[PDB]
Amino acid sequence: TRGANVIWFRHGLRLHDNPALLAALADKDQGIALIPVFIFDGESAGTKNVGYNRMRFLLDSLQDIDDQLQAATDGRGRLLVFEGEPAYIFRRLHEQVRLHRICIEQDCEPIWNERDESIRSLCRELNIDFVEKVSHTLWDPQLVIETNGGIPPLTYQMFLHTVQIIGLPPRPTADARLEDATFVELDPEFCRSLKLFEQLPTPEHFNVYGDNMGFLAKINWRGGETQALLLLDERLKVEQHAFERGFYLPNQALPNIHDSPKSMSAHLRFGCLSVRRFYWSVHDLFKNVQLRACVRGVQMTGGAHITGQLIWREYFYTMSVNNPNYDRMEGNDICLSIPWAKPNENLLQSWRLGQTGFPLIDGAMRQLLAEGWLHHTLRNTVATFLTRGGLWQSWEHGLQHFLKYLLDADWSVCAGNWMWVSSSAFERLLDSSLVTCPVALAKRLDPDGTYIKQYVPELMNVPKEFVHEPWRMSAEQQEQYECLIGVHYPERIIDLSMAVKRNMLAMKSLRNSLITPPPHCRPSNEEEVRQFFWLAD
Ligand X SMILES: Cc1cc2nc3c(=O)[nH]c(=O)nc-3n(C[C@H](O)[C@H](O)[C@H](O)COP(=O)(O)OP(=O)(O)OC[C@H]3O[C@@H](n4cnc5c(N)ncnc54)[C@H](O)[C@@H]3O)c2cc1C
Please state the residue numbers annotated as binding site for FAD: 235, 263, 265, 309, 376, 408-410, 414, 417
Q: Which is nearer to Mg ion, 34 or 264 (CB)?
A: 264
By the rule CB under 5 A, 310 interacts with Mg ion:
no
Provide the minimum distance between the beta carbon of 5 and Mg ion in the complex, in angstroms, as a whole number. 33
Q: Which is nearer to Mg ion, 119 or 275 (CB)?
A: 275
- Cα pseudo-dihedral 145, 148, 154, 155, rounded to 10: -120
**Binding test (CB under 5 A) with Mg ion, winner from 47, 70, 113, 263:** 263
Contacts of 351 (CB under 8 A, 6+ apart): 361, 365, 382, 385, 386, 391, 393, 401
Q: How many whole angstroms separate alpha carbon 413 and alpha carbon 376?
A: 13
Q: What are the CA-CA distances from residue 63 to residues 40, 60, 208, 222, 476 (Å)? A: 14, 5, 18, 11, 55
Q: What are the CA-CA distances from residue 301 to residues 308, 310, 410 (Å)? A: 12, 16, 29
Provide the minimum distance between the beta carbon of 402 and Mg ion in the complex, in angstroms, as a whole number. 17
- Binding site per annotation, positions: 235, 263, 265, 309, 376, 408-410, 414, 417
Q: Which is nearer to ligand X, 414 or 493 (CB)?
A: 414
Q: How many whole angstroms separate alpha carbon 55 and alpha carbon 61?
A: 10
Provide the minimum distance between the beta carbon of 322 and Mg ion in the complex, in angstroms, as a whole number. 28
CA atoms within a 13 Å half-sphere pointing along the CA-CB vector of 292: 1
Provide the minimum distance between the beta carbon of 265 and Mg ion in the complex, in angstroms, as a whole number. 5
Collapsing DSSP to helix, strand or coil, 530 comes out as: helix
By the rule CB under 6 A, 239 interacts with ligand X:
no
**Binding test (CB under 6 A) with ligand X, winner from 265, 299, 301, 400:** 265
| Phi, psi of 130, rounded to the nearest 5 degrees | -110, 105
Provide the minimum distance between the beta carbon of 231 and Mg ion in the complex, in angstroms, as a whole number. 7
Q: How many whole angstroms separate alpha carbon 384 and alpha carbon 502?
A: 14
By the rule CB under 6 A, 380 interacts with ligand X:
yes
- Please report, as residue ranges, which positions from 386 to 425 form the binding site for ligand X (by CB under 6 A): 402, 406, 408-410, 413-414, 417-418, 421
Q: Which is nearer to ligand X, 410 or 431 (CB)?
A: 410
The interface partner of residue 122, options being Mg ion, ligand X, none and the CB cut-off 5 to 8 Å by kind, is none
By the rule CB under 6 A, 268 interacts with ligand X:
yes
**Binding test (CB under 6 A) with ligand X, winner from 379, 401, 468, 522:** 379
Q: How many whole angstroms separate alpha carbon 55 and alpha carbon 51?
A: 6
Contacts of 522 (CB under 8 A, 6+ apart): 154, 155, 420, 424, 426, 427
The interface partner of residue 162, options being ligand X, Mg ion, none and the CB cut-off 5 to 8 Å by kind, is none
Collapsing DSSP to helix, strand or coil, 274 comes out as: coil
CA 357 to chain centre: 27
Provide the minimum distance between the beta carbon of 108 and ligand X in the complex, in angstroms, as a whole number. 15
| Phi, psi of 248, rounded to the nearest 5 degrees | -85, 150
Give the DSSP letter string of 410-466.
Answer: -HHHHHHHHHHHHH-TT-GGGGSHHHH-HHHHHHHH-TTSHHHHHHSGGGTTS-HHH
CA 234 to chain centre: 20
Exposed, middle or buried, 420 (CB in 10 Å: 0-12/13-18/19+)?
buried
Question: What is the per-residue binding string for ligand X in 480-519, x denoting contact by CB under 6 A?
Answer: ----------------------------------------
Provide the minimum distance between the beta carbon of 263 and Mg ion in the complex, in angstroms, as a whole number. 4
**Binding test (CB under 6 A) with ligand X, winner from 182, 263, 301, 344:** 263
The interface partner of residue 313, options being Mg ion, ligand X, none and the CB cut-off 5 to 8 Å by kind, is ligand X
By the rule CB under 6 A, 264 interacts with ligand X:
yes
By the rule CB under 6 A, 376 interacts with ligand X:
yes
The interface partner of residue 194, options being ligand X, Mg ion, none and the CB cut-off 5 to 8 Å by kind, is none
327-330: which pairs have CB atoms within 8 A and are 24 or more residues apart? 327/396, 327/399, 327/411, 327/415, 328/396, 329/394, 329/395, 329/396, 329/423
- Please report, as residue ranges, which positions from 431 to 490 form the binding site for ligand X (by CB under 6 A): none
Q: Which is nearer to ligand X, 253 or 504 (CB)?
A: 253
Provide the minimum distance between the beta carbon of 68 and ligand X in the complex, in angstroms, as a whole number. 23
Instruction: Please give the span between the terminal C-alpha atoms of the chain, in angstroms, as a whole number.
Output: 66
By the rule CB under 6 A, 316 interacts with ligand X:
yes
Query: Strand runs (DSSP E) across 261-406, as ranges?
Result: 294-295, 298-299
By the rule CB under 5 A, 264 interacts with Mg ion:
yes
Point out which residues pair with 489 in neighbouring strands.
485
By the rule CB under 6 A, 319 interacts with ligand X:
no
Residue pair 395/384 in contact (Cβ under 8 Å)? The answer is no
Number of residues that bind ligand X (CB under 6 A): 25
Provide the minimum distance between the beta carbon of 273 and ligand X in the complex, in angstroms, as a whole number. 9
By the rule CB under 6 A, 520 interacts with ligand X:
no
- Residues at the interface with Mg ion (CB under 5 A): 263-264
- Residues at the interface with ligand X (CB under 6 A): 263-265, 268-269, 309-310, 312-313, 316, 375-376, 379-380, 383, 402, 406, 408-410, 413-414, 417-418, 421
